[PDB]
Amino acid sequence: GAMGNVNCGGVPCKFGCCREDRCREIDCD
């Protein structure tokens, strides 16, 4: 039932790596 998503304080990002207040979906484990 739960979306299972995530959010970053710097930016809204359902899934990915959040760095420097920026979510990047690439070149990240």
Swiss-Prot record:
Free-text tissue specificity from the UniProt record: Expressed by the venom duct.
Compartments reported by the entry: Secreted
Keywords annotated in UniProt: Disulfide bond, Secreted, Signal, Toxin
Disulfide bridge partners, by residue number: C8-C18, C13-C23, C17-C28
GO CC annotations, alphabetized: extracellular region
Any GO MF annotation of the entry: toxin activity
This protein's domain notes: The cysteine framework is VI/VII (C-C-CC-C-C).
Family to which the UniProt record says this protein belongs: Belongs to the conotoxin H superfamily.
Purpose of the protein: Probable toxin with unknown function. Does not produce any changes in intracellular calcium levels in mouse dorsal root ganglion cells. In vivo, does not produce behavioral changes when intracranially injected into mice.
Protein name, as recorded: Conotoxin Vc7.2
Taxonomic path: Eukaryota, Metazoa, Spiralia, Lophotrochozoa, Mollusca
Residues of the full protein shown: 50 to 74 of 74
